[PDB]
Amino acid sequence: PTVDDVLEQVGEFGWFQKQAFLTLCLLSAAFAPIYVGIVFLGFTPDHRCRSPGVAELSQRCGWSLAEELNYTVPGLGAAGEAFPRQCRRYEVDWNQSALSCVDPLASLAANRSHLPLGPCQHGWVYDTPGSSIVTEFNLVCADSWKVDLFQSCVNVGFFLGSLGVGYIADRFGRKLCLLATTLISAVSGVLMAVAPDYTSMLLFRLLQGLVSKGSWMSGYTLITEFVGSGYRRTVAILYQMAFTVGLVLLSGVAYAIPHWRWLQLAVSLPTFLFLLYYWCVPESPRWLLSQKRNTQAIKIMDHIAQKNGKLPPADLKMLSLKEDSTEKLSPSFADLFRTPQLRKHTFILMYLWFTSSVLYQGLIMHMGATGGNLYLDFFYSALVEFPAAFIILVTIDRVGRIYPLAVSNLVAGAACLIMIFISQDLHWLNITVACVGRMGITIVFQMVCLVNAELYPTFIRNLGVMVCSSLCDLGGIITPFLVFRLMEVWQGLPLILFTVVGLVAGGMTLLLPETKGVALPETIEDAENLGR
Numbered sequence: 042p043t044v045d046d047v048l049e050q051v052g053e054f055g056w057f058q059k060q061a062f063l064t065l066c067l068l069s070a071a072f073a074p075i076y077v078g079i080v081f082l083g084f085t086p087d088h089r090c091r092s093p094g095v096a097e098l099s100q101r102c103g104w105s106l107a108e109e110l111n112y113t114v115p116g117l118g119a120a121g122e123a124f125p126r127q128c129r130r131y132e133v134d135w136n137q138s139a140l141s142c143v144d145p146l147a148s149l150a151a152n153r154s155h156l157p158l159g160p161c162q163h164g165w166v167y168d169t170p171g172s173s174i175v176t177e178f179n180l181v182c183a184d185s186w187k188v189d190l191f192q193s194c195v196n197v198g199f200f201l202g203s204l205g206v207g208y209i210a211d212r213f214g215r216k217l218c219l220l221a222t223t224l225i226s227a228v229s230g231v232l233m234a235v236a237p238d239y240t241s242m243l244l245f246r247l248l249q250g251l252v253s254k255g256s257w258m259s260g261y262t263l264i265t266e267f268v269g270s271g272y273r274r275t276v277a278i279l280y281q282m283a284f285t286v287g288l289v290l291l292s293g294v295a296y297a298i299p300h301w302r303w304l305q306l307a308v309s310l311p312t313f314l315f316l317l318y319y320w321c322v323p324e325s326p327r328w329l330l331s332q333k334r335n336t337q338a339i340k341i342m343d344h345i346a347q348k349n350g351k352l353p354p355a356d357l358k359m360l361s362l363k364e365d366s367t368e369k370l371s372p373s374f375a376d377l378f379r380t381p382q383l384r385k386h387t388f389i390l391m392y393l394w395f396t397s398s399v400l401y402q403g404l405i406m407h408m409g410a411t412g413g414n415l416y417l418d419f420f421y422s423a424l425v426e427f428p429a430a431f432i433i434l435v436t437i438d439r440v441g442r443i444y445p446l447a448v449s450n451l452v453a454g455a456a457c458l459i460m461i462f463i464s465q466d467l468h469w470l471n472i473t474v475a476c477v478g479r480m481g482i483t484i485v486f487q488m489v490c491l492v493n494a495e496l497y498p499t500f501i502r503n504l505g506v507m508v509c510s511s512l513c514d515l516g517g518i519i520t521p522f523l524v525f526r527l528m529e530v531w532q533g534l535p536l537i538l539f540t541v542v543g544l545v546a547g548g549m550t551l552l553l554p555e556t557k558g559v560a561l562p563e564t565i566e567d568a569e570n571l572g573r
């Protein structure tokens with residue numbers, strides 16, 4: 042009367058599993074707005090110094106937007122690529138000075154650079170009709186650094202929340218967390234849209250970042266536990282693919298409404314509405330069984346059978362773990378680093394996450410020039426993931442999990458190396474090769490997440506994935522400084538670093554025990570001899 046066998050008898054993937062997965066997938070998209078980052082909310086458009094006098098002249102004679110930029114603004118390319126033009130204002134009187142459209146400012150100085158440069162007051166004038174966080178508080182020229190501070194604060198919030206949310210998640214149940222985390226994320230999201238100052242915006246975004254990844258991972262583990270042992274691949278990969286669909290939909294709606302306030306206020310509400318379906322999914326049976334709450338576990342199991350409609354097995358009356366466990370099974374950080382096998386697994390998974398994140402950021406950084414339409418570029422970058430799902434979805438159970446993960450982790454680094462060595466000049470090849478690397482990295486991410494979820498004990502499964510995921514955000518934070526510094530020493534030093542990181546990670550993956558078609562562990566001692 043073990044949990045897995047009774048689950049087989051009552052249907053591994055029945056109509057109950059489909060409904061629960063539909064709801065959790067509806068939750069999946071809610072993580073796209075918080076994960077997409079500052080983009081679509083802090084895009085910096087073209088900007089020049091507003092002048093009062095230009096407004097008068099603009100109507101007097103025929104004008105064009107391109108023409109106004111050229112001979113009304115200070116020229117670019119002096120003492121910097123575009124530092125003068127962006128936020129420097131000549132401050133020559135354009136009002137009550139009728140010098141004709143042909144020669145508005147030429148006559149006075151007989152030269153441009155020598156002209157007198159004043160302060161860039163009167164705020165700024167922006168190109169795009171929409172408004173972003175940059176346009177709101179004028180964080181353009183003097184305070185430009187503030188945007189980087191905002192991004193770094195969000196990332197450090199991710200990093201802290203990764204560690205923090207795990208313990209509150211596993212000790213107090215997987216549905217007490219998913220409910221509270223998504224509720225806090227929703228309330229922070231709407232509260233943000235009414236932020237009048239810059240401090241409140243940062244604080245609310247920090248809270249949302251703290252809670253979002255916890256919500257997403259507690260949603261992931263729940264379905265992974267619910268589904269049968271054999272059908273884990275479909276549930277996990279379709280969860281990731283739902284996340285990708287949510288990303289595409291976010292790009293679409295972002296192009297729909299440019300304004301940041303309305304964008305946030307609209308995209309956040311569906312996460313709040315998801316709360317309306319909290320009553321659909323109950324607590325995971327395995328967690329309850331491991332906590333010694335057997336009556337609730339059997340009650341939940343009977344409900345699954347009733348909705349699925351096959352039959353209730355009479356053996357449930359004696360449902361319990363394989364071996365008579367101890368009264369208390371509290372999750373703690375100390376228990377994570379006791380068994381040598383579990384310690385080795387944790388170290389290997391941490392390194393895997395770190396290398397995956399570093400290689401991803403290196404690839405995106407080393408990409409080609411950005412396209413004219415940011416939205417179209419983001420749409421393509423999201424769409425490049427769909428074939429990854431249909432590649433992985435058919436290979437896991439047929440070939441196992443270690444080999445594809447290792448081979449993709451190797452091929453991503455190989456593609457980075459070939460891009461470094463082979464000509465990087467504008468050609469049709471390079472874009473497609475980069476797409477190959479993108480698909481490799483996406484496969485690595487999804488496979489690492491799945492294997493890490495499957496490898497840990499059930500009673501601390503969430504904590505393990507949280508800890509091993511923190512290094513992902515750590516690497517994402519640190520990589521830009523590393524690549525900037527290394528470039529100074531040698532032109533190609535960062536590329537060698539990325540390639541060696543990828544190769545070493547791919548080599549080290551092989552030692553991780555395989556999990557093809559084996560019931561996920563429920564006891565740390567049992568997980569220790571998983572390979573045996």
Ligand SMILES: *[C@@H]1O[C@H](CO)[C@@H](O[C@@H]2O[C@H](CO)[C@@H](O)[C@H](O)[C@H]2NC(C)=O)[C@H](O)[C@H]1NC(C)=O
Pocket residue numbers: 108111112147
């Ligand atoms: C761009 O600005 C420059 C300003 O230098 C314009 O080109 C010349 O500007 C000098 C300075 O006033 C004039 O003496 C020349 O007569 C300008 N060129 C010509 C062909 O007359 C230029 O016209 C501006 N851009 C456009 C599209 O006209």
